[PDB]
Structures are given as structure tokens and as C-alpha cells.
């Protein structure tokens, strides 16, 4: 969740929002180790309701999200019931585990390409185009993130762009991402430069991942 | 002497629109058949399976014409090669249908069928089914047959199965064209491009459009 302002801004300047629980648990083998364990499902469940309780009035907020790269767990399928319990209002989307698993309104990728299958097991990354014609499949798709921006890159853009365009189920997706997380540090005469992971002595880094 | 005489052109040809030449005639083969009086007039066989397909019941519904008798009977056998797998007999009279009764004048046959040989465009496997009309002490009247194989298509979740699994159809449409004879067919035409059709890695024909 973020700043209570940004919603505010939102609202009043116009830009569809997801709104989005602070969890993950990127770093847990397997993903899911918290989030399929009762025990952390109270700590989850706060995660997502105080969020709910705060931000529901903002028309702004379109969608809700359960977090960000957790796995699939039982605890995500309990608070994606209460959402869709609570506000019948906006749809809910969760990526983790697949980006179609029964938490999910919305098929949510993470860089799915337009073309090309990536069928890693247990959790592929279907082209977008396949992957909406699936058996059974009928849920539009969204990418979460797509045409990661890391130094010169998006390579390909347009290639979403008309994939999206000629396809009615693919409507769109949120490029990654806005900013680069550079910070300024100082050389030995105060003149500022742009540091990235690693810079501040702290190890173990990911170096310019951050931008 | 019989006397035939064909009409180029009918209301049958508005419907007969086909992208293909306009010809005319008795153009497929004639021939005369016997029948008894009492005698089969029609039947419909029917291979049901469970999930895994390790067992089948091959249902056959026979009709006959004629006067209706109580020593009248059906025998269905189904037969792989020479060996006989399954056999069921019984009297004319279906069950109830509705409030005025049943076909009296029809029978259905059940067979059961442990591990059948499964037919594909892969494997054709085929068992022959022959068809009895005879009296309870086993005078035969007469006997029809078809070959039969024992195969499942269904559509489930957006896909066409066969046997249970998802065909990918490597088609041909196929008129029935001969350069002197027309649209006339024979055996070893037919055979000509079933043999050129399979070793081309086609498993599948639509019969454009008749
Ligand atoms: C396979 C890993 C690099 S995960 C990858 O890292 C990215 C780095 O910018 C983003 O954080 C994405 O959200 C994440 O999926
Ligand atoms: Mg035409
Ligand atoms: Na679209
Ligand atoms: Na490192
Ligand atoms: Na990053």
C-alpha cells in the first residue's frame, strides 16, 4: 500500500490503480513455504484486510492485489474468498504460483512474452496469446509486469502493443517499472553520483538490478 | 428391361452447388437385392467405454419387418479374426418408451468387452459383427454384418479427443474425380489415394461435399 496521498492524486488526476498487500516472500524455498503454512496466515490476513479497510473508498483503486511473488498458498486462496467476500466491487488478481491459480480474476504474468512458450515446470510462462485459449481458460489477461526497463532495453515494445491491439482477452499489462531505485552519494569534492548495489558496502548485493 | 430415365437438371440442383465439374448419369454401381420378408431392416451399433477405456459394451439395436413372432430372435457376435470374444441373443420387444408401450418390433443387444482393440487412423484395429435374424432353435433366416471398430469421440474442455486423447487432424479434402471416367469410382482408385494419403502423413479425409 501505498502513501495515502498517491490514491488521492490518483483520484483526482485519473490513473487506474491496483492496489497491492505488502507481501512476498520472494526468498523462501519453495516460494510458498509461508504462504501454504496456517501460522502465517494470520500475519498475511492483516496484510491484506488493513489494507482493504483503508483504501476501499478510493475509486482510483480498480483492482486488488494480493502481493507479489509469494508462491501459491492455501493462506492466498482463504484472503482472495474475503476480499471478493468483502468488496464485490473490483476484481482481485494474484500472480504467484503460475499466474492463473484459483486466487486469481485475472491471468497476471510477469514477462510472458507475446510469441515465444517458456514452459518451465510446474509454473510456465505461456506466450500471452496461447496461454488465453488454454482448455477451460476464460479470464482476461493482464501482464503485472512486462518489458522489464533495466539500461537500454524494451526492446520488442511494439510487440505487446499489437498483440494487445488485435486481441480482445489481452488488455495490457504495467511495464517494469517507473524509476530507477539509484541513490546519490557524494565524492571527495560534494559532487553527487548515482549508486546502485553494492555501493554502500553492503553484501551480499544485486548490483544494478535496482535500476 | 428396366427403363431409367435421368434429368440433368432438378430442385436437386440447387442444393448440388459443389466447386467441382457438372456432370450427369447413373454414375455409382446398380445392383438387385433379396431380402426375406420377415428380414432386418435396419441396425445401429454403438461402443460405449469407462474412463480408461480397459472395458467397453459394444450396443447393438436391431429392426426387423415381417410379421412378428415370439421364436423370433437376435444374435449379435462379435468376432477378432477367427475367434468368436462376444455373443448375446434375445426376442424382439425393446423396452418401454413411452405411455403406449415399446418397439415390438425391435431389440437391443449388449455385449461386454474386456480390453477392446482400440480402433485409430494410428492402429485400425476392427472386430466383425455379425448380425442374426433366427428362429429360437436356430434355423437362420438371414444374416447382415459390418466391421466394427471400437473408438470414442467426444469434445471435453475445448478439445476433440479420440480414445481420450487430443487428435491433430492432418486433413485433405477429396472429390471424387477420375481424368476419363469422371466422377465415377473404383476400388483401385480409391486404394490409389488412400496408400499415397497415408505415406504422405495425412491421417484424416472430409468427403467434399457429399
Ligand atoms: C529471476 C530473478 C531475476 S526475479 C525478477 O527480478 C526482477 C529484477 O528487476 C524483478 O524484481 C522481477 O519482479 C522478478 O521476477
Ligand atoms: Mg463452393
Ligand atoms: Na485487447
Ligand atoms: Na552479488
Ligand atoms: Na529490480
Known amino acids: ?211 | 428391361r428396366l427403363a431409367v430415365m435421368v434429368l440433368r437438371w432438378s430442385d436437386g440442383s440447387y442444393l448440388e452447388d459443389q466447386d467441382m465439374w457438372r456432370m450427369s448419369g447413373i454414375f455409382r454401381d446398380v445392383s438387385l437385392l433379396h431380402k426375406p420378408t420377415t428380414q432386418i431392416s435396419d441396425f445401429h451399433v454403438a461402443t460405449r467405454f469407462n474412463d480408461d477405456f480397459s472395458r467397453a459394451v459394444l450396443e447393438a439395436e436391431v429392426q426387423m419387418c415381417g410379421e412378428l413372432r415370439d421364436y423370433l430372435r437376435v444374435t449379435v457376435s462379435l468376432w477378432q479374426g477367427e475367434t468368436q470374444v462376444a455373443s448375446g441373443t434375445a426376442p424382439f420387444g425393446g423396452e418401454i418408451i413411452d405411455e403406449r408401450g415399446g418397439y415390438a418390433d425391435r431389440v437391443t443387444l449388449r455385449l461386454n468387452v474386456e480390453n477392446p482393440k482400440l480402433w485409430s487412423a494410428e492402429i485400425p484395429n476392427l472386430y466383425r459383427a455379425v448380425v442374426e435374424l433366427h428362429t429360437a432353435d436356430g434355423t437362420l433366416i438371414e444374416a447382415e454384418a459390418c466391421d466394427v471398430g471400437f473408438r470414442e469421440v467426444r469434445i471435453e474442455n475445448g478439445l476433440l479427443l479420440l480414445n481420450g486423447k487430443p487428435l491433430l487432424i492432418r486433413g485433405v479434402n477429396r472429390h471424387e474425380h477420375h481424368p476419363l471416367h469422371g466422377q465415377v469410382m473404383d476400388e483401385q482408385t480409391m486404394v490409389q489415394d488412400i496408400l499415397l494419403m497415408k505415406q504422405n502423413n495425412f491421417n484424416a479425409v472430409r468427403c467434399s461435399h457429399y
Not at chain 1, 490518483?10 to 516472500?25: Q, S, W
Not at chain 1, 496456517?38 to 486488488?64: G, K
Not at chain 1, 485475472?106 to 509454473?123: G, L, N, S, T
Request: glycine letters at 8%.
Open chain 1, 1 to 211: 500500500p501505498n502513501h495515502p496521498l498517491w490514491y488521492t492524486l490518483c483520484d483526482r488526476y485519473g490513473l487506474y490503480v491496483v492496489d497491492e498487500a505488502n507481501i512476498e516472500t520472494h526468498g523462501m524455498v519453495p516460494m510458498n513455504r509461508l504462504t501454504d503454512d496456517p501460522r502465517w496466515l494470520p500475519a498475511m490476513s492483516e496484510r491484506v484486510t488493513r489494507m482493504v479497510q483503508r483504501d476501499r473508498n478510493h475509486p482510483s483503486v480498480i483492482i486488488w492485489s494480493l502481493g507479489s511473488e509469494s508462491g501459491h498458498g492455501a493462506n492466498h486462496d482463504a484472503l482472495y474468498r474475503w476480499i471478493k467476500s468483502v468488496d464485490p466491487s473490483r476484481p482481485v488478481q494474484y500472480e504467484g504460483g503460475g499466474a492463473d491459480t484459483t486466487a486469481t480474476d485475472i491471468i497476471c504474468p510477469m514477462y510472458a512474452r507475446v510469441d515465444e512458450d517458456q514452459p518451465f515446470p510446474a509454473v510456465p510462462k505461456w506466450s500471452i496469446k496461447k496461454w488465453l485459449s488454454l482448455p477451460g481458460e476464460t479470464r482476461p489477461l493482464i501482464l503485472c509486469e512486462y518489458a522489464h526497463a533495466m539500461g537500454n532495453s524494451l526492446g520488442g515494445f511494439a510487440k505487446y502493443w499489437q498483440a494487445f491491439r488485435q486481441y480482445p482477452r489481452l488488455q495490457g499489462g504495467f511495464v517494469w517499472d517507473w524509476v530507477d531505485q539509484s541513490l546519490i552519494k557524494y565524492d571527495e569534492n560534494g559532487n553527487p553520483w548515482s549508486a546502485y548495489g553494492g555501493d554502500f558496502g553492503d553484501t551480499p548485493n544485486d548490483r544494478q538490478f535496482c535500476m
